[PDB]
Symmetry: D2
Subunit: 256 residues, 4 copies
């Protein structure tokens, strides 16, 4: 009775087979990292145009500076003298509802919009406000109509002008963006919404969606760990004035 069942990778031969294809044969025939991602996560070789999109999603989301949770977690561990894989694992642990997770929720709700509200953006927005609250993939702290997110503008322009891919989730999100930005300038289609829609339009299943942010941000977290080690950075201690000690009154311990 086997303990585990696996379907994606076979290491038993002279080299691993990813969804039935020999790793060196993928290399030899000119395939890339983006193609191995499609094979191991979706058991399907991407088409030429899908491959170009996967490559761009990873490149555009590789890093977003040291202030955000994943990179900061990796930096904190690097400065505490932790080895690279363990430091990057601490930063990766930050990926969830507030850091990267909106990719999945945006994919889910824009897919629902296409299926249940195809010719009804007001109905979709009304249902979202009532049942979810803010629309996942809409809104940014600083990026806006006046200050666009070039990561979004580039990905959208590339998929629309350099591919023939039909993108109904992304198309719907772009129509919603026109409405939400008319309400408030900061209500843009953000990079999580963009990637979430594109991945649904590339036929990736809902539970694979987070893989793209996890993998891409690992590139950046490894980079931040290397950077801190190159600088011989010292242990981080949060400055006292950055902490609000809203603690209980000091008390004497009562006798038992």
């Amino acid at each position: 009775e086997p303990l585990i069942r696996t379907t994606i990778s076979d290491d038993r031969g002279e080299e691993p087979r990813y969804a039935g294809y020999a790793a060196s044969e993928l290399c030899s025939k000119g395939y890339g990292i983006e193609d191995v991602i499609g094979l191991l996560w979706n058991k399907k070789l991407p088409t030429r145009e899908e491959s170009e999109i996967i490559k761009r999603i990873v490149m555009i989301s590789a890093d977003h500076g040291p202030a955000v949770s994943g990179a900061f977690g990796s930096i904190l561990a690097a400065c505490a003298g932790i080895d690279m894989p363990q430091a990057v694992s601490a930063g990766m642990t930050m990926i969830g509802p507030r850091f990267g997770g909106a990719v999945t929720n945006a994919g889910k709700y824009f897919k629902m919009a296409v299926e249940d509200y195809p010719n009804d953006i007001p109905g979709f927005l009304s249902w979202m406000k009532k049942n979810v609250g803010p629309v996942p993939g809409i809104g940014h702290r600083v990026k806006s109509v006046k200050n666009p997110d070039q990561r979004v503008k580039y990905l959208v322009s590339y998929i629309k002008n350099e591919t023939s891919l039909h993108t109904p989730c992304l198309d719907y999100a772009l129509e919603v963006e026109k409405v939400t930005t008319a309400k408030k300038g900061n209500l843009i289609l953000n990079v999580d919404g963009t990637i979430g829609c594109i991945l649904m339009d590339l036929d990736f299943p809902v539970h694979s969606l987070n893989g793209f942010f996890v993998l891409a941000r690992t590139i950046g977290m490894i980079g931040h760990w290397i950077d801190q080690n190159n600088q011989n950075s010292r242990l981080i201690r949060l400055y006292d004035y950055l902490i609000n000690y809203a603690v209980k009154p000091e008390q004497e311990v009562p006798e038992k």
Copy 2:
């Protein structure tokens, strides 16, 4: 007084700059994930031939089945119902001296061989036996002269026949392999030794070396998590006969 100092990535503009280059501009000009890796880990755009090698190292090492520590850790967490980033972080935590770590040690000692024993393989082997023990990057449990590692054979053949790159560490390791395999057939140049030498020959610094295994194996760990979730796999419990309970004699608790 800033809390942290960063040198690799600037998110303050319309899009991130990786070692001074705009992410969308790298995409537009036909660069890939392998190029973003070079920028974020080494602050240098790889040459055309270096880029082809980085791409192949990642593709060849993306996964090696579910039995090994990283993939198995990710599977265990997936079967316990843990979300993808946290499950992959558990598998990534396994990367160290026995799982992936030999890449760094092989790079270090073959670089030392080139510098200190250039025309003296017997001297290098004698020093290694006395001061280290088995040579890192030499030996495999099942792969041998009779059963070659096609991952090694492919990477070596590609860098030698499809690039003009000078590879002194790899060349030295290949010369050592001829000697060690003459001693015992299983003493091949393994994939860790191969990649470790190539990365030293691509001028990556010693402490960046582990990034390649960490990033590549994240592709596979994400895949294994998705696979277990697609199958709706049940909680793993190690079968009783697989555990040797070499426990102490059962004793009564003494009165205090």
Copy 3:
């Protein structure tokens, strides 16, 4: 302006204050680890009976062998040569819906049972079957009416015969057990259900419930890491026959 707000601990003096009490003063006056747990997790010094219960919950939950996810994760990392904190972090990552998490759900649903179905076990069981699935805290793979869980029998007997604590959630769960075990012998009140109910009955906040399993099992995971290191245990590799390779048929890679 402050980055974080904290309410539980103040390190600024000659020693830390936990919910207002000096650590050495707690030691001096004969308080224990269980008292520090109550202070840091609930900002309240436990009463003597509450302290006795917290102590017992931790002792009973410290470990449950090497086959379960947390201990096994810690062992896998120990055998891969990973340092103790990082190895224990990998095992801790396994704590979730299938490993330990049922403590919180059992607490939540038995509290709901007391409030919404006080004299109606059939109504509670019907609602649970329809809206949740199997009742959290009910059932075990091997423990049963014939083979009782002495951890449960002890905790129940102690709280009923050695304390005056009012336990409505636990009382309800015990009444449910009388019904479910009459249906099938394995439908016992399990240790997660027992602890979850007791914690609810102790008025511990819903957010804190998982702390008890996390802390207690850390004792066992540290032990397993030490044990594997004392034995100089070798790298674990899952035996080939324990893996079902339900992989895709081998295919040639198509030309681009």
Copy 4:
């Protein structure tokens, strides 16, 4: 044939046996968490004096505010919406050479001092300066002769006045402190040095020393996670002025 060998815990009976003792029997006879720690980490029931020391080490070490790496890592994950076990695993990942790790080094080097430099503090200090660097367990950022660490003063006073335990490592460290504090007021025997020496003097195995900091700080990290969740704390973003962007000059991407 078995995959793993275990010696500390047996779950196969009606309840787990820790180093041969039944968990409920330890509870019944008045033993505590500190006794379970001795059993699972050292396979020996502590004596009453050893038990009192273990209890105090854990209580004194439970937390040291939110500014330090472990607690801060747990807070960062809590504020990113990560579940408790995974958040605490991120904080635990910070435990290493700069955060908690000095306990082991101080134990190791003060044991060496007793064995190799018994009546020779200048010889020990000279060897340490030449071969190690700053003496592990000596020095503090803010605690000094003028501002003592009450955690140290309490533990030292308790073991000297309330036990008959022979403490040669601790005695040596205290003699070193008399010399180093005469050189500079901040060169005190710190809490890591104190605990490390005491653990060595208790004959705990070198492999186990880190267990005490890992376990104790898990109490605090769980507390910090609960605290942030009670407050419904927002996502942390490191303020721009706290980051020094020492980035490369912006450049155009060259054509391939």
